[PDB]
C-alpha cells in the first residue's frame, strides 16, 4: 500500500534527470526587457463593491466585471461606456467569464451555481440562459470552451465540464485534495490546468476526464494559474508570495519569481501575447511585471487602493485590465 | 463633440445605467451587512426573531445577516469576501462545554484572521438558560472541561441578572472571559468584541445588534472624520 511512495520517488528521479540546466542559465545571454512603464489609460468606475473577477472579450474592447454588490457590468473599454449591467441573484460572485463568441457571459460565487447569461436576446434584456447546479462548494472560476461547454472549478475540490444546453456535468475532475481556486484553458482548449489550496497544480484532459500531470512546487494555496501562449508552460501565483513557471513537457518547475520585499500573496497571474512578461497582482495593492525568461521584476502597475483581485491581458495584447477591492477597474497600456 | 448619432445614444444608455447604479448604491450603503458565523447547536438560526440570508430593520435601519453554511472546513477562502461586513455575529452554545473549546478556537481563527482584522464581533452566548440548568443540576462541571474554572471568581464589575445563583453568574462570566481573553490579546483597537448573554426566548437581540453596530460605526466615523 506504500508503492505510492515508491512511485512518488520514481516521478521525482525522472524529473531530476530531465532538469539538466535551469531556464535562467539558458536565458542568461538574452538581453533583458528593460523597465516597462505602463500608465493607466482608462479607469472604469461603475461597481459599488469590491471587484472580484474580470474577463476580456475576444474583440479586446468589451470586458465583463463582477462585484460583491451583486452586479456584472460589460464595459466598452475604448469609450468607457457601460454596454450592459446584469443584476445577479446572489450578492457574492467570485468569478466571471466571457464567451469567446461574445453571445454569453457567466458568473459564480458562494451561490455554488454557475449562471450563463444570454447577452444577445431578441427581447433586448440580458436573461439567464441556464443555471448549472452540482458544485457542493463555491465556484471559484469558470471558462467557456465554447457556447455550449463551460469548465468550472469549485471549493468542493472538483472541477467539472458542463454541457450548457443539457445543464448536466459531461465530466468531473476529482483529483485535487484542496479547494480549486483557479483554472486556465490551454489555447488549443484540449487541456486545462487548475491550481488548488493543496499547493498543487494539476493538468487535465477535457476529453479524457483524467489528471495528466501533477505539479508540486508551492508551499501554500495556489491563488491563480495562467497558460503560457505556446500552450506548453503555465505560471501559478500563491500566498507563498512566489510565482512559479512550470513546463508541461519537462513536467517540472522552470523558474520562480519572488522578491525579498514581496511578502504578500499573488491574487492573479497573466502573460503578455509574446509571453515575455508575467504580470501578477499582489495584495500589496500593486501588480508587478516580471520578465518570464530572466526572472527579473521589470515594472510595477501601482495605481490601486486595495487588493488587486483580478488582472487580464487583451487577446491582441494591447492592454492589461486590473480589478481591485477599491471598486475601480483600471486599463494599463 | 465628434461623437456619431449612435455613439451619443450609447453614451445616453451608459448614463441611464449609471443612474440605476446610483439608486442601487443608496440601498447598498443603507444596508449594514453582518456575517452570522457559528456552528450547529449554536441556535444562530433563531438569534433574531425574523438560511444563508435574513433581513431585519431596527429604528428604520435595515440589516442583512449572511450565514455561509454551504462551505465547510477552512472557511479562510470564503471569509475573504466578507471583509466589508459591519460586524460578525458569533453565536456560541454556552451549554455545550465539550464544543466550547472548539468554539473558542473558531473565535481565535476569526478574530486573528488577516481580512477580519478591522471587523468587530458581536458575540452572543446563546442558550444561557441551558447553562443555568446544568450548573444547578450538577453532573456536568465546567471545571472538568476547563481546569481554570475552580480558580475563577465572578468579576466584581459583573452585574448579575435577578436571582441568578452566584455559581450560575460565575459560569456565565467564565465562558465570556475566555472569548474576551482572545479578543484583548490580539487587538490594536481596530476592532472590538461586544459580548451579550442571550437565550432562545430573548427577542431583544436585534436591538442589541443595533446598539453595537452604532458603536462600531461611531468609532470608525471618529477616525474617518479625523476627530480621533
Amino acid at each position, epitope marked *: 500500500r506504500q508503492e505510492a511512495e515508491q512511485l512518488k520517488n520514481q516521478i521525482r528521479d525522472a524529473r531530476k534527470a530531465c532538469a539538466d540546466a535551469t531556464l535562467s542559465q539558458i536565458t542568461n545571454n538574452i538581453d533583458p526587457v528593460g523597465r516597462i512603464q505602463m500608465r493607466t489609460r482608462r479607469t472604469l468606475r461603475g461597481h459599488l463593491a469590491k471587484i472580484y473577477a474580470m474577463h476580456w472579450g475576444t474583440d479586446s474592447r468589451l470586458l465583463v466585471s463582477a462585484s460583491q454588490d451583486g452586479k456584472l457590468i460589460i464595459w466598452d473599454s475604448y469609450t468607457t461606456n457601460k454596454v*450592459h449591467a446584469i443584476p445577479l441573484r446572489s450578492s457574492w460572485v467570485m468569478t466571471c467569464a466571457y464567451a469567446p463568441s461574445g453571445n454569453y457571459v457567466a458568473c459564480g460565487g458562494l451561490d455554488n451555481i454557475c449562471s450563463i447569461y444570454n447577452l444577445k436576446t431578441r427581447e433586448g434584456n440580458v436573461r439567464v440562459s441556464r443555471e448549472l447546479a452540482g458544485h457542493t462548494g463555491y465556484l471559484s472560476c469558470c471558462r467557456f470552451l465554447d457556447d455550449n461547454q463551460i469548465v468550472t472549478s469549485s471549493g468542493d475540490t472538483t472541477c467539472a465540464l458542463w454541457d450548457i444546453e443539457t445543464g448536466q456535468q459531461t465530466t468531473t475532475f476529482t483529483g485535487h485534495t484542496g479547494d480549486v481556486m483557479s483554472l486556465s484553458l490551454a489555447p488549443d482548449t484540449r487541456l486545462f490546468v487548475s491550481g488548488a489550496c493543496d499547493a498543487s497544480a494539476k493538468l487535465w484532459d477535457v476529453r479524457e476526464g483524467m489528471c495528466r500531470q501533477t505539479f508540486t512546487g508551492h508551499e501554500s494555496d495556489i491563488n491563480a494559474i495562467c497558460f503560457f501562449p505556446n500552450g506548453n508552460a503555465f505560471a501559478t501565483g500563491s500566498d507563498d508570495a512566489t510565482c512559479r513557471l512550470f513546463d508541461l513537457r519537462a513536467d517540472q518547475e522552470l523558474m520562480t519569481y519572488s522578491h525579498d520585499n514581496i511578502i504578500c500573496g499573488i491574487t492573479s497571474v497573466s502573460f503578455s501575447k509574446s509571453g515575455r512578461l508575467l504580470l501578477a497582482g499582489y495584495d500589496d495593492f500593486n501588480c508587478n511585471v516580471w520578465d518570464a525568461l530572466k526572472a527579473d521584476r521589470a515594472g510595477v502597475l501601482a495605481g490601486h487602493d486595495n487588493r488587486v483581485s483580478c488582472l487580464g491581458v487583451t487577446d491582441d495584447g494591447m492592454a492589461v485590465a486590473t480589478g481591485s477591492w477599491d471598486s475601480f477597474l483600471k486599463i494599463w497600456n | 463633440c465628434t461623437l456619431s448619432a449612435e455613439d451619443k445614444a450609447a453614451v445616453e444608455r451608459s448614463k441611464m445605467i449609471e443612474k440605476q447604479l446610483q439608486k442601487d448604491k443608496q440601498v447598498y450603503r443603507a444596508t449594514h451587512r453582518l456575517l452570522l458565523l457559528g456552528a450547529d447547536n449554536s441556535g444562530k438560526s433563531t438569534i433574531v426573531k425574523q438560511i444563508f440570508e435574513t433581513k431585519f430593520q431596527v429604528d428604520k435601519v435595515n440589516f442583512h445577516m449572511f450565514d455561509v453554511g454551504g462551505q465547510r472546513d477552512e472557511r479562510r477562502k470564503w471569509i475573504q469576501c466578507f471583509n466589508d461586513v459591519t460586524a460578525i455575529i458569533f453565536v456560541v452554545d454556552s451549554s455545550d462545554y465539550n464544543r466550547l473549546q472548539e468554539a473558542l478556537n473558531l473565535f481565535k481563527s476569526i478574530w486573528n484572521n488577516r481580512w477580519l482584522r478591522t471587523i468587530s464581533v458581536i458575540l452572543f452566548l446563546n442558550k444561557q438558560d441551558l447553562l443555568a440548568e446544568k450548573v444547578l443540576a450538577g453532573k456536568s462541571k465546567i471545571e472538568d472541561y476547563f481546569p481554570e474554572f475552580a480558580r475563577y471568581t465572578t468579576p466584581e464589575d459583573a452585574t448579575p441578572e435577578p436571582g441568578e445563583d452566584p455559581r450560575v453568574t460565575r459560569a456565565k462570566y467564565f465562558i465570556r472571559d475566555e472569548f474576551l481573553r482572545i479578543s484583548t490579546a490580539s487587538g490594536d483597537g481596530r476592532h472590538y468584541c461586544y459580548p451579550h448573554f442571550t437565550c432562545a426566548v430573548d427577542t431583544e437581540n436585534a436591538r442589541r445588534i443595533f446598539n453595537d453596530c452604532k458603536d462600531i460605526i461611531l468609532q470608525m466615523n471618529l477616525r474617518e472624520y479625523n476627530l480621533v
Partner: single-chain antibody
Amino acid sequence: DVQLVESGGGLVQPGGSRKLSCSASGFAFSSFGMHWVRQAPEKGLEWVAYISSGSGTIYYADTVKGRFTISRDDPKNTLFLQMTSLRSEDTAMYYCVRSIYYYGSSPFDFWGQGTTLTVSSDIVMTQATSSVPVTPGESVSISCRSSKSLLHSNGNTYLYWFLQRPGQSPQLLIYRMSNLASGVPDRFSGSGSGTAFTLTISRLEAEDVGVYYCMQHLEYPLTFGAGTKLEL
C-alpha cells in the same frame, strides 16, 4: 414574440390632428429608443421622429418639426405621435421602428406593420437604379451613393440596408455597412467605400423580390434613398 402593432390612423380633413399609438409587446420597450418612419403611398421611406430610451433626446424631421410631437409611456409600453396642423403631404403609412444603441447593437432591427394616415446639410442617399429586372439564381448589386462619407473617425460606416417585400414592413438586412442582421440569410453582403456602397444578393430567391432602401445613421435627420425594386 416581438410585436409593434400601431393604430390611430384614418381619413382626416386638412389642418386636423390625430395621435398615432404603437403598442410594444414581447420586448423591453423602455430599453429601446423608438423612431417613426413614414412611406408616402407612391414614394419611399422618410424618418419622421426619434424618441430615445428615457425620453431624454427627441429629434424631428424638418418637414414635421413643430407640428408633430413624439412621446413614450414606458409603463404602458406605448409610443405616441401627436400630429397637428396636418397637411396633404403628411398622407403616408407610419411605421414605428425599435432601435437599441450599444456597441455591437443592430439599430432599426424591428419595424411595425404600419398605420395609414389619409389627409384630404441633410446627407443625400442617391439610389440610381429605380428598378432592376432579375431571375432566380443570379447575383444583383443594388448600389447607393452618399453626399458625405458615412465613415466616421470611429471606423464605423453608418449605412443600413432594408428590404420592404411587397405588402410587408421593411426588414433590416445589413447594419453599419457590412454587418448582416440576425435572421438574415447569408446570401446578402454589404460592401462600401466611405461614400459609395453596394448590397450584393447572391443566388437571388423569390423571397428577395421587393424595394431595397439605403439609409444613413451618421447624423440626423436620418435620410433614406429612393429605393431599388427587384422584380422576378
